[PDB]
Design a protein around this ligand. Sequence first.
Ligand SMILES: Nc1nc2c(ncn2[C@@H]2O[C@@H]3COP(=O)(O)O[C@H]4[C@@H](O)[C@H](n5cnc6c(=O)[nH]c(N)nc65)O[C@@H]4COP(=O)(O)O[C@H]3[C@H]2O)c(=O)[nH]1
Ligand SMILES: Nc1nc2c(ncn2[C@@H]2O[C@@H]3COP(=O)(O)O[C@H]4[C@@H](O)[C@H](n5cnc6c(=O)[nH]c(N)nc65)O[C@@H]4COP(=O)(O)O[C@H]3[C@H]2O)c(=O)[nH]1
Ligand SMILES: [Ca+2]
Ligand SMILES: [Ca+2]
Ligand SMILES: [Ca+2]
Lengths: 307, 312, 307, 312, 311
Amino acid sequence: MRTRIFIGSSKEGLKEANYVKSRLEKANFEVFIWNDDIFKPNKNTLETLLNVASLFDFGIMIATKDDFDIFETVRDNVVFEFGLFLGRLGENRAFALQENGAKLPSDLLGITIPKFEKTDDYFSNYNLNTEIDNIIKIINEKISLGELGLLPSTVLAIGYYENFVSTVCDALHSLPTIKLNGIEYKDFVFNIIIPNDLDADIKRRAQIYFKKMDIHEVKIDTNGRSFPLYLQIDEENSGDVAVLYDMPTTLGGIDKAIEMYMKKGHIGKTSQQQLLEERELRNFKTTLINLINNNSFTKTFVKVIEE
Amino acid sequence: MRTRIFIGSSKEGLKEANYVKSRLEKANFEVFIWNDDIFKPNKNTLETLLNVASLFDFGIMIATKDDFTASRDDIFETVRDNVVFEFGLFLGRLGENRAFALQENGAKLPSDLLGITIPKFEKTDDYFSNYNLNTEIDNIIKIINEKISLGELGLLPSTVLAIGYYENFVSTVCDALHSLPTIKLNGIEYKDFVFNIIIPNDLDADIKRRAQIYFKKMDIHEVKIDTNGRSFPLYLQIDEENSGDVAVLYDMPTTLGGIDKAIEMYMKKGHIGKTSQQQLLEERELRNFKTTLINLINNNSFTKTFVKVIEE
Amino acid sequence: MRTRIFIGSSKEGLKEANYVKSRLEKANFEVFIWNDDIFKPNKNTLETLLNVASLFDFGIMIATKDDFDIFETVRDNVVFEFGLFLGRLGENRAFALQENGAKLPSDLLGITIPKFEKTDDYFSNYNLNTEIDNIIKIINEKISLGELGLLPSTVLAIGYYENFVSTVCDALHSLPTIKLNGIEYKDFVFNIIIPNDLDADIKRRAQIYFKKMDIHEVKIDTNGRSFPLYLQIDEENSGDVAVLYDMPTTLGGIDKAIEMYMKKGHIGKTSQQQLLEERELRNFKTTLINLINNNSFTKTFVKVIEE
Amino acid sequence: MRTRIFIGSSKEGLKEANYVKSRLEKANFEVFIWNDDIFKPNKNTLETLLNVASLFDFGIMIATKDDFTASRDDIFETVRDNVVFEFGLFLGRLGENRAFALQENGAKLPSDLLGITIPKFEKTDDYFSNYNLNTEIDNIIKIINEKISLGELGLLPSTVLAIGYYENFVSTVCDALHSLPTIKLNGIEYKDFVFNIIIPNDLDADIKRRAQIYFKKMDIHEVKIDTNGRSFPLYLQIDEENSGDVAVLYDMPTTLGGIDKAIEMYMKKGHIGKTSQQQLLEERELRNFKTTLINLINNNSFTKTFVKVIEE
Amino acid sequence: MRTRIFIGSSKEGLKEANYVKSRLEKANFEVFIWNDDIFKPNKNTLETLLNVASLFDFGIMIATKDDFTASRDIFETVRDNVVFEFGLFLGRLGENRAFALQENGAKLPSDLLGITIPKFEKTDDYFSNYNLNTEIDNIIKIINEKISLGELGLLPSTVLAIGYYENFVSTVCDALHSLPTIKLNGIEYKDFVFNIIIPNDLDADIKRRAQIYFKKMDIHEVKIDTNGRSFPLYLQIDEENSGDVAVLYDMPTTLGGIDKAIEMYMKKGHIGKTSQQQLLEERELRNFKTTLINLINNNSFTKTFVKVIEE
Ligand SMILES: Nc1nc2c(ncn2[C@@H]2O[C@@H]3COP(=O)(O)O[C@H]4[C@@H](O)[C@H](n5cnc6c(=O)[nH]c(N)nc65)O[C@@H]4COP(=O)(O)O[C@H]3[C@H]2O)c(=O)[nH]1
Ligand SMILES: Nc1nc2c(ncn2[C@@H]2O[C@@H]3COP(=O)(O)O[C@H]4[C@@H](O)[C@H](n5cnc6c(=O)[nH]c(N)nc65)O[C@@H]4COP(=O)(O)O[C@H]3[C@H]2O)c(=O)[nH]1
Ligand SMILES: [Ca+2]
Ligand SMILES: [Ca+2]
Ligand SMILES: [Ca+2]
C-alpha cells in the first residue's frame, strides 16, 4: 500500500499543512494531518503526537513564526511539540519545515529544518517546493533500500525469515530432485499468506484457510535445524512447480501483544489500536519482502500473497 | 536484575539528580544519570536522550529554576526553549508510562502534562530534611514498584517476541505434557516434568549455534511431543541422565536469534566493535524478554510451577 | 434502542433535572427522573435510588445549596444519596453536576463534579451547556468502544458468543464448499433471534418460532469443540446463501434468574423486574453485536434479528 | 469454603472492627478489614469500597461517635459528611441484603435506613462483657447463617451462569438418564449413574483447553445421550474403566470460560499480572458459581443424590 | 603498536605540520611528515602522496595562505598544485581516514565531501592558539573513537583476517565449546586456549616459517571434528606446557597469500625491498592483527579463549 506520512502543525499552519499534504498526495503518498477525521478522540494537538505519531512511516512538522494553551507560552508549546514529535518518530522518520522568520535551529540532532517564505499562493514558491521535493526524494530512497527500525513487526519478520523461510529455501534447493509427499517436482514456489487484518486469531484463521483451500501437509528435513520443517502443499493446483503455503504464526504473537497493550475494559477497537495493527502488518510484509528480495535463493522462489 | 532508571537534567541540576540517584539506590535500583561515563560518545545532553533514554526501564526528569530564563546554550537561542525541548524529547522517548518528572518551585512547567504529574519541591541545601522532594521520590518509587509488580507491558520487540514464544511454544508444550496420563518421552516413563528455558548471557554469538553447542556440551538429547494444539509435533530436548524421577527439558528460544540479528542490522555501522548504545539495547532486550517470559509463566496455573527460566 | 439515562436530584433540583432531561432528549437519549410516572411504588428518593438506579445505562446527580427527612440533616441526606448513587452505578456509569459553589469534592473517586451557575433562564448558561455537552460526548464515546461491565447479561453474551457463534463461523469458514443437508451453498448468513421480552420460556418460544417459520435442523462438525455444532436452516428462502437461525438458550437462564430473584410472592411483575428485564435484553443484544462486529469471521456473516 | 465478610470502619474504629472480626473467626468466618495487607493498591478507605467491597459475601460497618463531628480529612471538608458518604457507598456496593451496620451510642445515623437495622451499643474498654454488642454480633451471625443455609441468591454473573448451566444441561441429562429402563452408554450396561461436575481450582487457564487436557490426562471417553428435552443429543464424558457397576460421568462447565473471558476483558488493563481486585473477583465468581450449582442440585429430587460437585 | 598518521603540507607550511606532529606525538601516536627521512626515494610531495599516503592508518593535510596566489611547480599555478594534492590525498586515504586543517583566510570549503576543514589562525608560538589546539584535539578524539570501535575498510589484510576468523577460529572455538569434555590426542583437558602466532614480518615464507616454529617449540598436530564444516579442523597442541588448560597453536596461512601478493606487486627487478614495500608489509600485518583481535573480542565464545601472540 501507499506510504503513510503524518503532518503536525499548529492552528495557524493548516494552510501550509494542507499544501504539503496535497503535494505529497500528488507524489503517491498517504497523508494525515493532526486534525484528521481519524484523530477525533484525541483532545488536543499534544496527545495526538504522543499516541498516534509513531504509528506512521514518516512525519513532517511545520513551524510558524506567528506561533512564537497547555503551557503558558505559545513558544513553549511549539518547542515542546517539536521535541515530542522528534522523540516519537526518531531521527530517521522525522522531517521539519519551518517558515521564514521562525527561530528554531537548523541542525537539531541530525534533522534539518529548512526555512521557506510565507506567501499566499503556494503554487509559486520555489524554496518550499524544492524542500518538499527533497523530503519526498529522501523518503523514496529510504523505502527502496529498506531502512529498518526496532519495531516489533520488523523483528518478527527478520526472525521468521531467517529461521523458517531461508531454511526452507536452502532445504529445497539442496535436493537433487524435489520429492514432496511422494510426488516429484522440477521446481517450487513458496507462498506466504499474510492476513488482511489482525481481527481474528492467527492459528485458527490459518487452519481454516488451509481447510478451505484444501492444502495438505509436508515435512522437509534440513541440516540447518535439529528438527524438520513442516509445511503445506497444494497437490491439486501444483502440476510441475511445487506450490507451498504458510501463514506466519509470529503474527499471532504481535496480535496478542497489541490486544494486551491496547485493550482496556472495552470490546471495540480504538483508532490508535487499528492504526497500530495496520502499521505492524505493513512493516511485517515490507520487511519480509525486502529480506526475500535480497537473497538469491529466495528471490524468485518466495512470494508474499494476501489472504 | 535491578530496575534501570535514567535521570536527565541540565548542567546545573547535578545536585538534584545526584541526590535522587542516591535515594533510588537506597531503594534497590540501578540509576544512571545523563552525565555518567557510559554516555561519552554523546556530545551534548540532547543526543543522550535521542539515543539511550528509551533503553532504560524508567526515566526521571529534574527541572530547576535556573534554565527557565533567556540565555545562550549553543543549541537553542534560549535556554528555556532548550529545557522545554529536552522535556518533550524525554517524554516522547519514554512515553507516558515510563516517564517521571520533578520540578522545583518557580519553574514554568505545567502540572498535568499529558498524564504526567510534575510535582513541585522547595530547593534547599540539605535534601535529607526536604519533606516535599523526599515524598515525591517516594511516590515515584511506589509507582515504579507497582508497575514492575503487575507486568506493565509495552510494544517493545523483546516483549512481543516473549509473548509470541510463550503463547506458541511454552503453553502448547505444557498443555501437551499435562494431557498425558503418564509422561513417556523417548520410551522412558516419568512422574513429573520441569521445563527449563535457557536464556543466553548475551547476544554476542549466534543464538542457533550457541544453543547447539550448549546442548552438545551438556549432552542433551532431542525428543518429540505430539500435541492437539498444533498441526505438527513439538520438538524439545531432554537430559536423560539427571532426569530420573522428574523429566528435565531444555530449550533456548530461537526468536532471540531474530532480535539479535535485527539489533546487528540496525545499530552496527561499518565497524567490528559495538557501541555503548548497542550494548545497552541488547541488555534491555534480553532483560525484557526474560522478565516478560517470567511474568507470562507466573500468570498461568499450567506453567507457574512447571516452567523455570534459567540463565545460560 | 435509545440509551437510558437516570437523573437523581432532590425536591428543589427539579428545574435543573427537567432542563437536563430536555437537553438529553434533544441529544437522542432516553431520560427518566427519580419521580417519574414509572417509579410510583417507590416511597422516598432513597429506595428508588437504590432499587432501580442500577437498571439504567448511566446516571446524573445534581446538588443544590438549598439542600445543605430520613436523616437528621438535609446535608447528610444529600451526601448519603450521592454515596448510594456511586455504589449503584460505579465509577464508569455515574456522572454528577453540582450547582455553583457546592462543597462536594471535585475528584470523588475519579468522577468530576463540575459547578454550574444557578440562573432562571437555563438557555443562557454557557458553563452548564458545555458541561452537559461534555457528558454527552463521554457517554457517546463509551458506547462506540463497547465499554463492558460485570452484568450477568454481558457475561452471558460473551460466553454465548465465544463458545457458540465464533465456533460456528469458524466451522463454516473452514469448508471448501458449504454443504448443509446435502445442498450446496456459495455463502452463509447466521441469524440470531432475540426475543422481544422475557415473559415466556425461551426454549418453548424458540421451538414455536421455528415451527411457525418451518426451519429444519442441521449438524456441523468442528475442530474447535469435542462434539458437533447443531443449528437450524431454512432450506426454502435460502437459494444461494445458507440462512441459519438460532435463539440463545442462556436467555432462559437469565429470565428465570430474575424470576427467582424478584421475591415472587405474587403473580404480576413489578416495575423493577420489568425494567431489569429490558435492561438485560438490551445489554445482551448490545454485547453480542459488539462482539460480532469485532471479528472478521463473524462481522458480515452474523445478523441479530428481532423476533 | 468459608464465608468472606468485609468490615469497614474509620481510622479510629479499629478496636471494634478487630473485636468483631475475631468473634467472626470464632464463628468460622474469613474476615477482612479495610486496613488489611491485601488492600494495598487502594490509597484510601474510599477506594476500598468502590473496588473490593462488593467482592465479599457479606459486609459489616461499625460507626463510632468520633467521626460524627466537624474536622478535616483531606477528602471531605468534614468527617461527618465523609462517614455518611462512606456509609452510602458501602450500602450501594452491598445493597439491602448483604450489608450490616453497627453504631455506638451518640451516633446520629438512623436505625431503619432502607430496611438496614443499625443497632446501638455501649462503648467500653473491656469489650468481652458488652451485652449489647455481643448480642448484636450474635444476631448478625444468625442472620448470615440463615441466608447461607437458604438458597439466597443475587444477580451476580456467576449465579446466573450456574442457574443457566444447571437448568439447561444437568437437569436435562438427569431426566434423560432417569427415563431409561437401563443405562446403556457406548454399548455397556450399567445399573446406576453418577454425574461429577469438575470445577477448576482457579481461572488462570482457558476452561475449554483445561477441560480437554484433563480428559486426556484421566483417559476419559466421550458419550452421546439422546433426550426429549432438547432438539439435539447431549454429549458427555465417561471413564469406562473405573465405572464397573455405576456409570461415572465427567463434565467441566464451559460457561466458566465465559466468566473467565469477561473478567479478563473487564479487569485487566495493559499489564500481564493480575491485580488483587481481579483475583478477589475471580475467587468470588468461582465460589458463587459452585455454591449456586450445589444449591440447585440439592433443591431437586432428580439431581440431589445423582450429581456431585468436585474440585479439579 | 602506536597508530600511524601521515601529515601532508607544502614546503612553506612545515612549521604548522611540525607542531601538529609534536602534538599528536604527545598523544601516543606515530607521525610521519611528507619530508621525513623515510620518503627519500620519492621525488616530490605529489609522488609521496600517491605511493605511501595510503599506507598509513590516517592522514592530515595542512593548507596555508601562502601557496594560494597565481605563482609558478608541476602545475602552472601553485593554486592548482594545492588543490590537486588535496584531491589526491583525499582519494588515497578516503573519507574515513582523511583529515584537513586549513589556516585562517584559506579558500577551501568546510564540508568537502564529508571532510571538515576547520580554519585556524597562523601565529609564531603555537602553544597559544586555542582554535588550532581544539581542532587537533577533535581530530585526536575522532581517531581514538574510530580505533576503539574497529572501523574497517576493504583492505586485503582486513578481508584476510575476517575470512580467517569466521572460517577457522570461530569454527575451532565452537567445536571445542561443544565438547562435554576436551579430549585432544587422548588426554583430557578442563579448559583450552587458542594461541595465534603472528609473524614479526613478512620477510620469510609463511608456511616454512610456521613449520620451523612448530618444530622448534615441539608442537604436535591434533585433529578436531566440527559440525560447522565438511572436513575436520587440524591444529597444533603443546602437550608439554599444557597440564590442565590445553594450549593450541596456529600461524595463519593467508599471510602467505598477502606476502606473495605484496612481493608480486612491488618487486620490479631488484632483490632489496623498497621503503614503500616495507611500509605496505607492516601496514598489512598490523591491520591483520588488529582486525583479528577486534573480531575475537566481540564474540563470547572467542573472547577469553583466543590470544594473539607474536612469533
Ligand atoms: N509451518 C512452520 N512454521 C515455522 C516452522 N518453524 C518456524 N516457523 C515459523 O517462524 C516463526 C519463527 O520461528 P522461531 O525463530 O524458531 O522461534 C520460535 C521457537 O523458538 C519456538 N518454537 C516453536 N516451535 C518449536 C519447536 O517445534 N521446537 C522448538 N525447540 N522450538 C519451537 O517458539 C518461537 C516462535 O514460534 P512461532 O510462533 O511458531 O513462529 C514461527 C513460525 O511462524 C515450522 O517448522 N513450520
Ligand atoms: N443451537 C445450539 N446452541 C448451542 C450449542 N452449543 C451451545 N449453544 C448455545 O451457547 C450457549 C453457551 O454455551 P456454553 O458456553 O458452552 O455453556 C453450556 C455447556 O457448558 C453446557 N452444555 C450445554 N450443552 C452441552 C452439551 O451438548 N454437551 C456438553 N458437554 N455440555 C453442554 O451447559 C452450558 C449452557 O448451555 P446453554 O443454556 O444451552 O447455552 C448455550 C447455547 O444457547 C449447539 O450445539 N446448538
Ligand atoms: Ca486481534
Ligand atoms: Ca550480535
Ligand atoms: Ca616476503
